[PDB]
Amino acid sequence: LAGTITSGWTFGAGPALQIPFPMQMAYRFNGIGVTQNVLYENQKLIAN
Amino acid sequence: FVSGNCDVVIGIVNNTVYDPLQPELDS
Numbered sequence: 001l002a003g004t005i006t007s008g009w010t011f012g013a014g015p016a017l018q019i020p021f022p023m024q025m026a027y028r029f030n031g032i033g034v035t036q037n038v039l040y041e042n043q044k045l046i047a048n
Numbered sequence: 049f050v051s052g053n054c055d056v057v058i059g060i061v062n063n064t065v066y067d068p069l070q071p072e073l074d075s
């Protein structure tokens with residue numbers, strides 16, 4: 001849990017590199033075909 | 049790429065975005 005929260009998927013393929021959690025969520029949103037601005041503009045709703 | 053304005057995002061930062069076209073136009 002700590003690894004997947006503080007470093008995303010990097011810790012599973014080498015050294016663990018830190019990254020802020022909203023930026024990781026933006027990365028994962030890009031993973032499924034949605035742009036970052038959607039998450040950055042609906043962060044509060046998504047967290048709720 | 050541009051989207052929206054500078055109040056919705058949390059953690060936005062002042063900086064400058066260079067435009068390649070302007071110096072060519074002025075030259």
Ligand SMILES: *[C@@H]1O[C@H](CO)[C@@H](O[C@@H]2O[C@H](CO)[C@@H](O)[C@H](O)[C@H]2NC(C)=O)[C@H](O)[C@H]1NC(C)=O
Pocket residue numbers: 054061062
């Ligand atoms: C980042 O965004 C802009 C960049 O100029 C700033 O917005 C104005 O900045 C001036 C000078 O700093 C202030 O007097 C104004 O009150 C700001 N707001 C508006 C609506 O004009 C902003 O202050 C910059 N810095 C941040 C957001 O920390």
Ligand SMILES: *[C@@H]1O[C@H](CO)[C@@H](O)[C@H](O)[C@H]1NC(C)=O
Pocket residue numbers: 058059
């Ligand atoms: C990041 O953390 C510092 C101190 O922990 C805090 O002052 C700052 O507001 C945080 N960043 C944002 C975007 O809130």
